Amino acid sequence: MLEVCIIGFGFSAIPLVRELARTQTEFQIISAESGSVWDRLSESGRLDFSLVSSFQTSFYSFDLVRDYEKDYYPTAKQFYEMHERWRSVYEEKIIRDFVTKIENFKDYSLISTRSGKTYEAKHVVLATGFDRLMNTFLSNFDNHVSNKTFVFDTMGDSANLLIAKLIPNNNKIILRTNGFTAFDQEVQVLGKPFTLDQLESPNFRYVSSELYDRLMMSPIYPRTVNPAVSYNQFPLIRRDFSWVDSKSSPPNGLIAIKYWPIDQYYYHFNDDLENYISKGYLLNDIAMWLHTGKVILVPSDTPINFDKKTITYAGIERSFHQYVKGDAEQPRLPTILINGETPFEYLYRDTFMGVIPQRLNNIYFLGYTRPFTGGLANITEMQSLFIHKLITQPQFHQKIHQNLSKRITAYNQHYYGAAKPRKHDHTVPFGFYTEDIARLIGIHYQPNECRSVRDLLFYYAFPNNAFKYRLKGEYAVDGVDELIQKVNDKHDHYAQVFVQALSIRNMNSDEAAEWDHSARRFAFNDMRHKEGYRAFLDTYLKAYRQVENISVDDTVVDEEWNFMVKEACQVRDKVAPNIESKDEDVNKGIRLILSILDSDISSLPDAQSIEFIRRLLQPKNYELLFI
Ligand SMILES: Cc1cc2nc3c(=O)[nH]c(=O)nc-3n(C[C@H](O)[C@H](O)[C@H](O)COP(=O)(O)OP(=O)(O)OC[C@H]3O[C@@H](n4cnc5c(N)ncnc54)[C@H](O)[C@@H]3O)c2cc1C
Ligand SMILES: N[C@@H](Cc1c[nH]c2ccccc12)C(=O)O
Ligand SMILES: N[C@@H](Cc1c[nH]c2ccccc12)C(=O)O
């Protein structure tokens, strides 16, 4: 009887296959000939973009220990090459075929295939990814489209990449959305670049719900009156958040765009522009786009008839070339037959940690939990460890499964509360999930085991990347020691972010919000840092048209558009004129912490930072019931 069958092999299954090989557990892989979207994109030569997530969050620990020198954003080419490299290692263990049906019994499943071969396995893992409407626009994108108008009903990373590729051919873009949360992918902290996933310090949730919420929620909720922030200059960017019924912030179910702010784009790529664009580093600054009117926001019920293909905003009847519906992603699940008769219904919320379904035996889901920020790698590595331990250690299997039904109800209570299931339930803060899985496995850190102030920085401020949990214990990876050292030395041990929590502990929601924005450049959607880069933008667009061999006439003026922009940017052209502390508070906080770094916490004497730093040994909201 085959012990483990893995269905689908692309990116998600890679670390589970590694653990099964390591323990010499018996496994076969079934994966389709056709491959993934990355195989589509490679074939048609469209691996010409970059990830919206950092190296440290996007490649697995066993690759990072060998290949990390600095923080950067990998290209689509680099991500693919890394899938392919791992595919080559395991190809001989992969049966090329398509699973059409799984019949699940008490201690085995019967797997049926397109070819007609059947397989019996005790443990089955699905790692099949998602179908995405948007993949076709992307995989079959026509660059000859010039001077046309596009309407998008949804803003996601996929829409944002399409927009990046359209604007250089002077294609005009209308968003007819109920708003969107967007973040600068890279940010300046007193002159050093941090990826947004380095500043989330998630373990501070354990000190209190209320404190973590102040740290994180101001750039997402409309909590500041500061007229520099995109969501005051362009209020139609704001979303309905009435659905949220959870004290856990940022809530599960919140999706965001990650984009290159033009300033950071400038700092990295200005000196070799054509070369960078051709590797896949594309300017996708949605906030620059609103500021320059190259995109505009129109309310979600604006007038448009799909028959004549027109949208009507002001008194211009605007001919549009295409409507883009909205990226829906549903798991590529085969038919699963409960007891071999009753079709299993997939619902993220009715699985434990996105992995363990109810009513099925020895079936696990790998790759169907989405990170709010950072790459999938953080989520799939910890899932691979979770599933590996469940499969190879019957003790662990029993413990989790014993009260699985209550675990799921406790989890849904904590993270979703009473809110109706939503299509984005599968979206979790990465540094919550990695840590949740760490505590179920038992490869977590105990805060009470922190000795020095250094140790408190590691526990609270050092990101909860999967590799953070592979330094020691059951799933230790060699090299992580060195890796953590390099990351610490390049990021001043994450003191800056640790000092953030200190600065806002005594503040309230409103105070915290305005402090977050009292910087010269606040982290996210600072509209003071756009106008300066209008000339670089024109140089960028020129450089893009050179790499993509495009000719377009800028001497040709679409008048119709300019008038539409004026109406969109009204609140902006009124609120932006009223422009003209965090910087100083971090400055002196970092100096204080970089001095008492090796100081014993218990030793610390009875300003009030001190008392709070000592209570970090006994956080009062450590309780997670679903564990
Ligand atoms: C355009 C795009 C950009 C992305 N950018 C990023 C990024 O910047 N950062 C990041 O972290 N993540 C990113 N992702 C998400 C993630 O990294 C990819 O979705 C990744 O391909 C998911 O890996 P997977 O292994 O779960 O699925 P896939 O890579 O799709 O692999 C699943 C495999 O299973 C096969 N298969 C499916 N059904 C069956 C079946 N019934 N039987 C047999 N074989 C089957 C498929 O053919 C495929 O070969 C991006 C995704 C897309 C689409
Ligand atoms: N705590 C940091 C970073 C941060 C806030 N909200 C975020 C959301 C996503 C990623 C990072 C963040 C800040 O206040 O600026
Ligand atoms: N393009 C897909 C998947 C995706 C893009 N970037 C990601 C980063 C992490 C995880 C998944 C993704 C979507 O947003 O629908």
Numbering used by the authors: 1 to 580, 586 to 611, 632 to 652
From the manuscript:
We thus focused on modifying M216, F372 and L183 and eventually obtained recombinant proteins of triple variants including AI-L183F, AI-M216Y and AI-M216W and had their catalytic activity tested. AI-L183F, termed AetF-AIF hereinafter, shows higher production of 5-Br-Trp compared with wild type AetF (271 ± 7.7 %). Despite the 5-Br-Trp production level of AetF-AIF is slightly lower than AetF-AI (271 ± 7.7 % vs. 306.7 ± 6.9 %) (**[Fig fig2]**), this variant produces no detectable di-brominated product from 5-Br-Trp in reaction incubated as long as 8 hrs (**[Fig fig2] and Fig. S2**). Therefore, AetF-AIF was tentatively defined as a C5 Trp-FDH, which was subjected to the subsequent investigations. As shown in **[Table tbl2]**, AetF-AIF exhibits higher *K*_M_ and *k*_cat_ against Trp compared with the wild type enzyme, suggesting that the triple mutations render AetF higher catalytic rate and lower Trp-binding capacity. Structural investigations indicate that Trp adopts the same binding pose in wild type enzyme and AetF-AIF (**[Fig fig3]**). We solved the complex structure of AetF-AIF and Trp and found that the bulge that accommodates the Br on the 5-Br-Trp is missing AetF-AIF (**[Table tbl1] and [Fig fig3]**). Altogether, we conclude that blocking the space near C5 in 5-Br-Trp in the AetF/5-Br-Trp in addition to preventing the flipping of the substrate is required to achieve complete elimination of C7-halogenation activity of AetF-AIF. In comparison, variant AetF-AIF shows highly specific regioselectivity and comparable activity to the wild type enzyme.
The first documented single-component Trp-FDH is AetF from cyanobacterium *Aetokthonos hydrillicola*, which catalyzes consecutively bromination on C5 and then C7 of Trp to generate 5,7-di-Br-Trp. More recently, a class of “single-component” FDHs has been identified. These enzymes fuse pyridine nucleotide-dependent flavin reductase and FDH on the same polypeptide chain, an advantageous feature in the application aspect relative to canonical FDHs owing to the omission of including a flavin reductase. The action of FDHs requires the reduced flavin and molecular oxygen to generate hydroperoxyl flavin intermediate, which oxidizes a halide ion to form a halogenating reagent hypohalous acid (HOX). The flipping allows the carbon-to-be-halogenated to be oriented toward the catalytic residue K258 and within the hydrogen bond distance to the putative general base E200, such that the halogenation site on two substrates is switched from C5 to C7.
